[PDB]
Amino acid sequence: SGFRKMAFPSGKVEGCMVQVTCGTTTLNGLWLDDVVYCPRHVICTSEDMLNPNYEDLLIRKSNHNFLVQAGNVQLRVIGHSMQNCVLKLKVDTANPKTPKYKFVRIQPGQTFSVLACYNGSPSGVYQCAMRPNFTIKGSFLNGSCGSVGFNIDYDCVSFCYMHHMELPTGVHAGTDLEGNFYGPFVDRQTAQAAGTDTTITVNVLAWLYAAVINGDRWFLNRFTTTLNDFNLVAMKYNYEPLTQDHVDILGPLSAQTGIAVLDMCASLKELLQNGMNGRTILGSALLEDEFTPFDVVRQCSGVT
């Protein structure tokens, strides 16, 4: 029993972190096989960030201008290329600790673990979600760029995020490992406002199921609703619309607890309208939305 915001064990990713320096800028890189991936803004000065022409700035850089250090040992860079907003630095040595891996592009609402790093060294691990506005609410200071987000399926690490930017509002933006930004964000120091950060409804319902499984049941009510009625309330509260696909995904939690998905929707509808009244659910005074239905099943079953 008990339910925690839990990150994946970070060891497999720690073995991939390296430091990348270009000129006066140092950030993190991800070393997989003989390639080091890092944000292309490693080539920029503070001034360059205002309106960078990456293709032009990159012409002035050679392989020897990218300093890659793994622990206290220097890697030899034998090639470099830009793919979208990431640089791929080909090195002469395959990372001996390369785990089984995939590069995946996640959808909003999906959760992942971040291994926050500085100077190629891991500082901490935390769990977050791709927000519906394509930002993430992370914990990143200057030097954390190139830190990555990932999920693990037994022994395969699916990398889904690489940190690039902090928006003027303190929220974060980054790319998948092919260098494509999530959402409309760009690697330029300019006005980039985020859209509405709506609540991930299917994750809230999954978390209410985790609460019932772990004994917190006070919010269960005598009501039911329909998808259309629920969605009218969800729209009003800036919650994402719930679809039949989401109801299907919640099926195993509904089966385990015996609480129909639409009945849990009705409980959530009353929590939205009435509030918590100073009460808590799984130690929280707000409805948590950074646990997917898969995370709830995984934690409640004990998948290693």
- Could you list the active site residues? 41, 145
Site for ligand PVR in 131-150 (CB under 6 A): 140-142, 144-145
CA distances 296 to 120, 199, 205, 218, Å, are 32, 17, 10, 19
User: Binding residue for a second copy (CB under 8 A) from 29, 39, 143, 293?
Assistant: 143
User: Binding residue for a second copy (CB under 8 A) from 128, 173, 247, 259?
Assistant: 128
When asked if residue 274 is in the footprint of a second copy (CB under 8 A), the reply is no
When asked if residue 214 is in the footprint of a second copy (CB under 8 A), the reply is yes
When asked if residue 283 is in the footprint of a second copy (CB under 8 A), the reply is yes
Report the amino acid identity of residue 113: S
When asked if residue 4 is in the footprint of a second copy (CB under 8 A), the reply is yes
The DSSP 8-state label assigned to residue 107 in this structure reads: P
User: Binding residue for ligand PVR (CB under 6 A) from 49, 227, 260, 272?
Assistant: 49
CA distances 146 to 88, 97, 149, 156, 179, Å, are 12, 18, 10, 20, 11
User: Binding residue for a second copy (CB under 8 A) from 69, 83, 84, 123?
Assistant: 123
Ramachandran area for residue 3 (φ above 0: left; ψ -120 to 50: alpha; else beta)? beta
Residue whose token pair is 């099926």: 251
Residue whose token pair is 């960078």: 52
When asked if residue 270 is in the footprint of a second copy (CB under 8 A), the reply is no
Closest CB to ligand PVR among 107 and 142? Answer: 142
Q: How far apart are alpha carbons 41 and 141 in whole angstroms?
A: 15
Site for a second copy in 149-208 (CB under 8 A): 166, 170-172
When asked if residue 119 is in the footprint of a second copy (CB under 8 A), the reply is yes
CA-based Rg of the chain, rounded to a whole angstrom?
Answer: 21
Residues that bind ligand PVR (CB under 6 A): 25, 41, 44-46, 49, 140-142, 144-145, 165-166
